[PDB]
Amino acid sequence: ITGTSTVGVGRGVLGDQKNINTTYSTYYYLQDNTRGNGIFTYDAKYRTTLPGSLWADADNQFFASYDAPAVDAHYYAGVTYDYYKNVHNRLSYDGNNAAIRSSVHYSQGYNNAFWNGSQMVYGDGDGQTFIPLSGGIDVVAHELTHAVTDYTAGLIYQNESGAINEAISDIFGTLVEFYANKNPDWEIGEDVYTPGISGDSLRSMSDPAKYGDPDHYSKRYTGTQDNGGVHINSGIINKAAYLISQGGTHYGVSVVGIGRDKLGKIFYRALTQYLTPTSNFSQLRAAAVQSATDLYGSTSQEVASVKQAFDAVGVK
Numbered sequence: 098i099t100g101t102s103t104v105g106v107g108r109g110v111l112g113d114q115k116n117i118n119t120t121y122s123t124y125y126y127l128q129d130n131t132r133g134n135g136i137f138t139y140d141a142k143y144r145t146t147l148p149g150s151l152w153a154d155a156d157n158q159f160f161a162s163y164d165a166p167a168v169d170a171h172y173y174a175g176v177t178y179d180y181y182k183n184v185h186n187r188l189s190y191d192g193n194n195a196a197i198r199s200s201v202h203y204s205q206g207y208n209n210a211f212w213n214g215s216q217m218v219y220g221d222g223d224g225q226t227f228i229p230l231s232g233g234i235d236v237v238a239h240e241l242t243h244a245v246t247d248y249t250a251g252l253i254y255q256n257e258s259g260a261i262n263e264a265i266s267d268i269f270g271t272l273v274e275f276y277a278n279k280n281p282d283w284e285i286g287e288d289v290y291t292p293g294i295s296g297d298s299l300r301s302m303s304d305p306a307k308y309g310d311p312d313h314y315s316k317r318y319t320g321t322q323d324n325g326g327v328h329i330n331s332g333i334i335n336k337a338a339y340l341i342s343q344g345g346t347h348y349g350v351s352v353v354g355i356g357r358d359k360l361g362k363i364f365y366r367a368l369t370q371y372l373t374p375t376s377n378f379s380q381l382r383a384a385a386v387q388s389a390t391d392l393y394g395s396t397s398q399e400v401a402s403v404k405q406a407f408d409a410v411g412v413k
């Protein structure tokens with residue numbers, strides 16, 4: 098809508114207070130005009146029709162329980178946008194400042210989230226397995242990254258390419274988490290998962306096997322579930338990414354960590370320059386070393402660490 102840019106205040110899923118960019122026109126809307134072509138947050142009102150209606154508030158104060166998820170989706174989207182802009186010099190997911198849209202309160206007791214090809218969607222969870230998904234910054238960034246991937250490499254959502262697609266989302270979701278410095282970790286969705294059970298998480302990048310995910314190419318899932326295990330085999334790449342950044346010894350192979358920042362640069366470059374819709378793990382390996390090479394030279398430690406990492410997860 099057309100109106101006056103302003104700032105509201107509200108409480109997020111975790112009960113934290115924060116300021117949000119809104120737009121004033123009769124009502125106060127969850128419309129952030131400060132970022133690219135804007136960030137829009139909608140209310141799906143427990144239905145499945147999208148996107149629903151642009152979030153309207155009467156007083157610019159979002160302290161109602163029903164508001165929480167909207168606050169977070171809106172806020173975290175902004176943070177994610179900033180990350181891409183500040184860090185990778187990317188303007189929105191399309192690189193052309195496309196408007197970012199999210200819908201919350203999707204369905205009833207919906208334990209998931211997704212990028213529908215046009216926007217982000219978040220369920221509220223059943224309150225047992227999950228709480229409103231937008232409460233996790235890694236989650237929001239994961240979703241937004243799916244968009245980035247779509248506009249770039251276009252990795253098809255199945256089998257190996259789909260696993261890569263997933264890993265990308267986990268990696269960047271994690272990097273964004275570190276970027277915001279919000280109790281950063283190498284875990285996925287710990288903030289909205291099992292309300293419930295402390296210390297747990299949906300996925301682990303540092304130790305995927307902890308949750309039954311493969312951490313070695315030899316343990317790759319080859320069935321048909323999960324689109325051919327896109328959310329499973331991602332653990333392999335996730336583990337690799339972890340090693341590149343943090344370093345360590347996995348299956349007898351030692352990897353010298355190069356740090357988060359370099360990890361991001363390397364992966365972003367691979368994503369945007371070398372990956373294709375049908376790329377596989379092995380292709381991912383080549384893209385990654387090519388990027389590092391481009392960035393730090395063939396004889397660099399960076400290239401070295403990338404190689405060891407892939408070796409460590411049995412990806413040649």
Ligand SMILES: CC(C)C[C@H](C[Si](O)(O)CNC(=O)CCc1ccccc1)C(=O)N[C@@H](CC(C)C)C(=O)O
Pocket residue numbers: 208209210211212213230235236239240243285286299323328
């Ligand atoms: C919390 C976690 C990061 C959320 C992830 C969502 Si997703 O974007 O990877 C996949 N979402 C869907 O498949 C929703 C249905 C759909 C809509 C449109 C097109 C295709 C599918 C995530 O990792 N989800 C996985 C784990 C769940 C327990 C949350 C999963 O969906 O398997």
Ligand SMILES: [Ca+2]
Pocket residue numbers: 154155156157158159160
């Ligand atoms: Ca209000």
Ligand SMILES: [Ca+2]
Pocket residue numbers: 274279280281282287288
């Ligand atoms: Ca965390």
Ligand SMILES: [Ca+2]
Pocket residue numbers: 235271274281282283284285286287
């Ligand atoms: Ca996390």
Ligand SMILES: [Ca+2]
Pocket residue numbers: 287290291292293294295296297298
């Ligand atoms: Ca938990």
Ligand SMILES: [Zn+2]
Pocket residue numbers: 239243263266
């Ligand atoms: Zn995903």
